Amino acid sequence: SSDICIVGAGISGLTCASHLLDSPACRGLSLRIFDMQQEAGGRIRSKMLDGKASIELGAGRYSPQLHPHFQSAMQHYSQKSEVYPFTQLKFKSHVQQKLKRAMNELSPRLKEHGKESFLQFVSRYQGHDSAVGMIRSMGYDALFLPDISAEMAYDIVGKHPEIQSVTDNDANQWFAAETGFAGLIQGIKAKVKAAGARFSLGYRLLSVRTDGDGYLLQLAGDDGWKLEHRTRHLILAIPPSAMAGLNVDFPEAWSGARYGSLPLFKGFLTYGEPWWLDYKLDDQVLIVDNPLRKIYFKGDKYLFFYTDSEMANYWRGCVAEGEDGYLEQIRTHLASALGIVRERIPQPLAHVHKYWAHGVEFPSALSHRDSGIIACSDAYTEHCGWMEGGLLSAREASRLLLQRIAA
Amino acid sequence: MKQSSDICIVGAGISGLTCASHLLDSPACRGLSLRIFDMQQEAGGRIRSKMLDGKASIELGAGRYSPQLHPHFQSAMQHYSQKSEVYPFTQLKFKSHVQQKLKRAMNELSPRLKEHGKESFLQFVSRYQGHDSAVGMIRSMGYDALFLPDISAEMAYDIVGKHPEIQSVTDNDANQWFAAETGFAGLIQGIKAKVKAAGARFSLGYRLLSVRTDGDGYLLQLAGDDGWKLEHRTRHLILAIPPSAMAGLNVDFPEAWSGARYGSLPLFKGFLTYGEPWWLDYKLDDQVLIVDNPLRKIYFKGDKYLFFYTDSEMANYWRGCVAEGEDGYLEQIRTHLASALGIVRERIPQPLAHVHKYWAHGVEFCHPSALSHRDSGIIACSDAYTEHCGWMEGGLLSAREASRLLLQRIAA
Numbered sequence: 001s002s003d004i005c006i007v008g009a010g011i012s013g014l015t016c017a018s019h020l021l022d023s024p025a026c027r028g029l030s031l032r033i034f035d036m037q038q039e040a041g042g043r044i045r046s047k048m049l050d051g052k053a054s055i056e057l058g059a060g061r062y063s064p065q066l067h068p069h070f071q072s073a074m075q076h077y078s079q080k081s082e083v084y085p086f087t088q089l090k091f092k093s094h095v096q097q098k099l100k101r102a103m104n105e106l107s108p109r110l111k112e113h114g115k116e117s118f119l120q121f122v123s124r125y126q127g128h129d130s131a132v133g134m135i136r137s138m139g140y141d142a143l144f145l146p147d148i149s150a151e152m153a154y155d156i157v158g159k160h161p162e163i164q165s166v167t168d169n170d171a172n173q174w175f176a177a178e179t180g181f182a183g184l185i186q187g188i189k190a191k192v193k194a195a196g197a198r199f200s201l202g203y204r205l206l207s208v209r210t211d212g213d214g215y216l217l218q219l220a221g222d223d224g225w226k227l228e229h230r231t232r233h234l235i236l237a238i239p240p241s242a243m244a245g246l247n248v249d250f251p252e253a254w255s256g257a258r259y260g261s262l263p264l265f266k267g268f269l270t271y272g273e274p275w276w277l278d279y280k281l282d283d284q285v286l287i288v289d290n291p292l293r294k295i296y297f298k299g300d301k302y303l304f305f306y307t308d309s310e311m312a313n314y315w316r317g318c319v320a321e322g323e324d325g326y327l328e329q330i331r332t333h334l335a336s337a338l339g340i341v342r343e344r345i346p347q348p349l350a351h352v353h354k355y356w357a358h359g360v361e362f363p364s365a366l367s368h369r370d371s372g373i374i375a376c377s378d379a380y381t382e383h384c385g386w387m388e389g390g391l392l393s394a395r396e397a398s399r400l401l402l403q404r405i406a407a
Numbered sequence: 408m409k410q411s412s413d414i415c416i417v418g419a420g421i422s423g424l425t426c427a428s429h430l431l432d433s434p435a436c437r438g439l440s441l442r443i444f445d446m447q448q449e450a451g452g453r454i455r456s457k458m459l460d461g462k463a464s465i466e467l468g469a470g471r472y473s474p475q476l477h478p479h480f481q482s483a484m485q486h487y488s489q490k491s492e493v494y495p496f497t498q499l500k501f502k503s504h505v506q507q508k509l510k511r512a513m514n515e516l517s518p519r520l521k522e523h524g525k526e527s528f529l530q531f532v533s534r535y536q537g538h539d540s541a542v543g544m545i546r547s548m549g550y551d552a553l554f555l556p557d558i559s560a561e562m563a564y565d566i567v568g569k570h571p572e573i574q575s576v577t578d579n580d581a582n583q584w585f586a587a588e589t590g591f592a593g594l595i596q597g598i599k600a601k602v603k604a605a606g607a608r609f610s611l612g613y614r615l616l617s618v619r620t621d622g623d624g625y626l627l628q629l630a631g632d633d634g635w636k637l638e639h640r641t642r643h644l645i646l647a648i649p650p651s652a653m654a655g656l657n658v659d660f661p662e663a664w665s666g667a668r669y670g671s672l673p674l675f676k677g678f679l680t681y682g683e684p685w686w687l688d689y690k691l692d693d694q695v696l697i698v699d700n701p702l703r704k705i706y707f708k709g710d711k712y713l714f715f716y717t718d719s720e721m722a723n724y725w726r727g728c729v730a731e732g733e734d735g736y737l738e739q740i741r742t743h744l745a746s747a748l749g750i751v752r753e754r755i756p757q758p759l760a761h762v763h764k765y766w767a768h769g770v771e772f773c774h775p776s777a778l779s780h781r782d783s784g785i786i787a788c789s790d791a792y793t794e795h796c797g798w799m800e801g802g803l804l805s806a807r808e809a810s811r812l813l814l815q816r817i818a819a
């Protein structure tokens with residue numbers, strides 16, 4: 001049993017646990033935290049690549065200008081940051097240069113035509129085909145969705161480091177975690193644990209029912225063992241896709257909005273020599289019209305690519321066919337991306353990859369209209385798709401729960 | 408990119424791997440592609456061997472076999488050059504009064520088996536000295552499944568006689584028992600390597616979700632550990648998975664397969680290693696203790712380690728104990744070990760390392776040795792369909808039949 005139960009040990013659930021444990025208003029209550037995975041962090045996942053190279057299979061960068069709450073958290077938990085170099089396109093193509101002119105020249109038309117789709121909006125510059133080539137050169141295939149409006153896309157573009165240069169956020173700075181964002185997760189977890197909260201990792205919430213003034217949760221361990229938990233206050237710090245698997249009538253009984261998701265894929269490769277130094281590619285990012293889409297060269301340490309939507313599924317399908325075919329395709333697409341023959345690309349010594357079926361999903365926190373369960377996720381904020389959104393939702397979720405306790 | 412095969416086997420346990428080996432050896436089957444799925448990242452299923460701390464091979468799943476009862480398993484160990492060793496837990500060195508009394512009771516009651524052998528084991532034994540005495544006797548066998556109302560006296564007599572710790576209760580001492588010198592995982596890997604070298608393709612980490620007939624073949628929907636959906640087309644399908652897994656699919660199990668029903672029980676094993684073999688002072692090495700105590704069955708493996716093995720409610724008890732935290736779980740073992748050994752709690756030290764495994768459906772039970780879908784022709788393979796339900800020998804027997812059933816389909 002517990003007074004307060006949080007389902008989800010991502011940055012959102014851990015942060016709202018920290019807020020509640022700090023509050024002098026509800027001191028002494030027991031706090032129980034569940035997560036279906038054996039480790040906290042959710043879509044924050046830091047790994048060591050072969051030798052001594054820390055890499056981010058999930059969230060990777062932040063901007064102090066856009067994400068003040070996240071910068072504050074990094075400093076609060078004494079987490080060191082380092083410069084994130086992939087904030088400009090050094091070898092801009094013609095279509096990328098033309099994109100900048102189109103974005104700025106069409107920008108005043110956002111006032112009256114901001115609601116139409118981004119593709120249709122950009123088509124005003126030189127027609128459909130030209131718009132496709134320009135939008136493609138930003139490396140985020142989500143921008144082609146018909147639901148994303150022009151003003152919505154301008155906001156999205158202005159938030160990403162590789163392409164911010166085409167917006168009024170072109171002065172924003174970007175950083176990464178020196179040791180990986182896992183260090184921040186573990187910092188919050190240790191503080192929450194030292195304060196007396198109980199963690200039950202490896203238990204998935206299946207269903208919830210109202211039990212008088214509290215709730216009865218049905219969970220299952222990853223070995224199938226069924227567990228029941230009673231709580232007085234419940235926060236679901238899980239993304240919308242996870243809410244759909246529950247029996248809580250999401251989103252109908254929570255808000256008047258709908259939610260969607262897109263897959264994401266990252267692949268990291270190390271080599272015997274930093275061969276890309278010969279092409280002056282260290283600390284540069286290339287956005288290309290081939291399945292790699294976005295290629296990054298981190299100093300002299302490793303390279304990686306990052307894609308979404310259909311290309312993420314393509315690479316995951318490529319992994320399911322075998323490692324040899326997977327690395328072969330990477331080698332082919334690296335060669336064409338660099339404009340050189342395949343034989344000049346070496347073979348890697350080690351590699352790791354990660355596929356997120358719902359890597360990105362889209363009031364800062366929600367409440368069930370009848371039961372009072374609180375829902376916490378970046379998808380409910382103006383920073384959907386960003387760790388900052390989780391912190392904003394967590395602050396609002398803890399505020400909602402404190403009002404529930406004080407009532 | 409498209410996934411397709413002539414033959415698909417879902418399940419990389421001993422049953423699925425063996426029927427793959429049979430099919431690859433068949434001359435009337437050469438040239439066909441074979442694809443093998445399993446939801447786990449490693450083959451073996453309920454065979455799971457691990458290294459406890461330094462150098463100590465332990466069996467979190469299947470642990471022992473008898474060459475008298477399980478000749479196909481013995482032959483497989485030999486065929487793949489897997490060395491065996493004596494399984495020492497075959498006698499009760501400290502027979503309790505209730506254990507001695509149950510042997511006498513089952514003997515003296517045996518003339519009543521003809522007329523009353525169909526009633527529950529508990530009710531049958533109750534005819535000796537009443538209900539309470541029967542509970543005490545049956546409890547001392549260490550297998551709580553024997554209390555189930557669906558386990559008849561006739562069934563229990565056979566069950567008692569085929570388990571190493573209590574086989575002496577029905578004078579079945581002629582059964583030798585062996586374990587793997589390096590773990591039964593070595594046998595699994597031996598089969599897998601043979602199957603892989605023969606051309607079969609393994610896709611581990613993919614769980615079958617549903618199956619639909621697709622003309623003369625089948626269309627499979629699978630999901631990887633990361634939620635990625637995989638579609639696979641095959642012509643011939645063997646589901647080498649237990650009944651509980653079959654019931655999770657959309658293949659009308661067991662209605663379209665047999666007239667029998669199927670059940671399961673949970674199992675739990677816990678292993679502990681210490682800085683010294685403290686149990687040697689009590690002459691417990693290579694001995695097993697059966698106790699009216701949540702540990703139920705306590706084993707001491709030479710001077711290497713000890714473990715306990717439980718089923719049914721006590722399996723769930725220890726799993727809930729794990730959920731409370733390692734400290735409370737280890738201290739609960741310490742308390743129950745002291746009570747079982749009749750020694751002071753402080754005399755038992757704390758373990759250096761430990762590991763445990765909970766099998767929600769550790770044993771599955773219920774008539775040919777393999778089944779077929781009366782409409783779609785899908786083949787099912789499991790130890791639960793054999794007279795050796797709950798034993799690896801059953802998987803080997805089911806695989807023989809399943810392979811013959813598929814070869815018939817291929818030749819039709």
Ligand SMILES: Cc1cc2c(cc1C)N(C[C@H](O)[C@H](O)[C@H](O)COP(=O)(O)OP(=O)(O)OC[C@H]1O[C@@H](n3cnc4c(N)ncnc43)[C@H](O)[C@@H]1O)c1[nH]c(=O)[nH]c(=O)c1N2
Binds near residue numbers: 037356388
């Ligand atoms: C590849 C990639 C790249 C990026 C990013 C993501 C990904 C996948 N992000 C987004 C960022 O990772 C994201 O916004 C936050 O990590 C979300 O944190 P939450 O805790 O809200 O959800 P998150 O998904 O992290 O955690 C939810 C937790 O709930 C658990 N859970 C779900 N259902 C459950 C159930 N039924 N029972 C029990 N537990 C359950 C899950 O296991 C999970 O641990 C990012 N952001 C950013 O700021 N900068 C960046 O550069 C990027 N880049």
Ligand SMILES: Cc1cc2c(cc1C)N(C[C@H](O)[C@H](O)[C@H](O)COP(=O)(O)OP(=O)(O)OC[C@H]1O[C@@H](n3cnc4c(N)ncnc43)[C@H](O)[C@@H]1O)c1[nH]c(=O)[nH]c(=O)c1N2
Binds near residue numbers: 468652674788
């Ligand atoms: C604790 C304990 C102790 C013992 C035993 C079990 C346990 C749990 N057994 C019984 C023995 O483990 C059992 O008889 C065989 O291992 C069963 O082999 P199968 O391959 O038939 O099923 P098994 O369950 O081993 O394998 C089935 C495989 O199918 C896979 N699968 C299931 N559904 C799937 C899906 N939808 N998609 C993809 N894959 C799927 C599973 O992941 C699994 O690998 C035993 N026997 C014995 O002879 N002597 C002994 O001492 C013991 N003791």
Ligand SMILES: [Cl-]
Binds near residue numbers: 356357358359
């Ligand atoms: Cl995901």
Ligand SMILES: [Cl-]
């Ligand atoms: Cl007596």
Ligand SMILES: [Cl-]
Binds near residue numbers: 765766767768769
């Ligand atoms: Cl199981």
Ligand SMILES: [Hg+2]
Binds near residue numbers: 004020021026028
């Ligand atoms: Hg609290």
Ligand SMILES: [Hg+2]
Binds near residue numbers: 021025026027028
């Ligand atoms: Hg509190």
Ligand SMILES: [Hg+2]
Binds near residue numbers: 318319321322
């Ligand atoms: Hg491939």
Ligand SMILES: [Hg+2]
Binds near residue numbers: 325
């Ligand atoms: Hg491929």
Ligand SMILES: [Hg+2]
Binds near residue numbers: 380381
């Ligand atoms: Hg959103």
Ligand SMILES: [Hg+2]
Binds near residue numbers: 013016235237397398
């Ligand atoms: Hg939260």
Ligand SMILES: [Hg+2]
Binds near residue numbers: 436441
């Ligand atoms: Hg074959």
Ligand SMILES: [Hg+2]
Binds near residue numbers: 430435438
């Ligand atoms: Hg064959």
Ligand SMILES: [Hg+2]
Binds near residue numbers: 731732736739
């Ligand atoms: Hg406990």
Ligand SMILES: [Hg+2]
Binds near residue numbers: 727728729736739
């Ligand atoms: Hg306990």
Ligand SMILES: [Hg+2]
Binds near residue numbers: 773793796
């Ligand atoms: Hg059976």
